[PDB]
Ligand SMILES: [Cl-]
């Protein structure tokens with residue numbers, strides 16, 4: 428009776444949900460916000476971090492990457508969303524890392540703009556993170572141009588993470604981009620969003 | 632050959648360094664800051680995140696957990712720092728998660744205090760993170776009280792990450808702790824810091 432705790436509008440929560448489904452692991456989804464339902468969340472995990480995974484035996488896990496590591500173990504080698512071959516796995520880890528970096532910077536911009544008064548915003552911080560955000564997608568765009576991702580309907584962790592990251596960035600920090608930027612990244616993300624597993628796991 | 636970019640006073644860089652040594656993988660260390668030497672770091676990894684691992688072929692990786700995943704694969708199954716059986720691996724992942732959570736919150740308090748003018752610091756944000764930080768170590772404490780970590784000379788990822796986290800928190804956010812808090816966590820960390828691999832990888836020079 429796996430249980431995923433968190434809102435799907437969080438890229439970290441969403442990547443775990445889509446990975447769970449792609450891995451073929453049934454679960455219960457509890458949409459609880461770490462902001463609007465702080466106590467209910469704390470009652471499940473006192474650190475109040477989303478996503479939180481409650482295992483069958485009740486063990487509580489956090490950090491999307493560690494949770495997925497667990498799920499990969501639970502699903503077995505054949506179901507893996509990661510390549511096992513070293514060079515291919517290396518490329519996959521770089522793509523996921525860039526996607527997670529994009530998520531991190533996007534969330535940082537959101538937190539800076541929404542968890543403190545406008546008076547307290549720090550221009551230098553926003554500038555720094557915004558540049559890092561642009562860099563993360565730029566690096567991803569370059570990787571995708573070198574070796575496009577398959578569009579056979581199947582998904583790997585890089586594909587899941589990149590698509591979730593892009594959609595999240597466009598929903599929350601769209602002002603950081605010009606319409607035509609990162610065409611390959613946007614292209615894969617919009618293709619992915621039309622896949623059954625993405626349609627069944629809406630961000631909102 | 633393998634290069635680790637980043638300063639060891641970062642718990643994320645340090646956990647990778649100790650993991651590298653623990654896996655028996657040789658590497659070169661470039662202690663480069665992401666602040667004063669921002670441009671130098673950007674030339675290596677434009678996203679400018681520490682740690683950054685430059686692979687023997689030149690590929691660039693970031694995020695300590697992903698880097699360690701690559702390293703475990705590179706090292707081989709014989710050298711893993713993680714248990715493979717489900718129950719044991721589950722516990723290990725829970726421990727690593729709590730330690731990473733402590734690192735995250737500790738770093739958030741440091742950034743709120745050190746990267747912005749005093750006038751721009753927001754008390755409610757600090758109060759929130761501070762509570763989460765106390766919660767993380769509280770959970771770790773209960774876990775260790777229930778089932779102590781082995782003290783036999785070798786290390787797992789939970790041990791490495793827990794110790795690196797505790798020491799970092801004491802080094803940069805000491806005001807958040809009283810002497811009597813989290814004795815089991817403090818105890819293992821203090822034990823771990825005296826192990827050869829931790830002594831050979833100091834948080835500061
Ligand atoms: Cl997470």
Ligand SMILES: [Cl-]
Nearest residue numbers: 571575576615
């Ligand atoms: Cl592509």
Ligand SMILES: [Cl-]
Nearest residue numbers: 643682694695
């Ligand atoms: Cl990291």
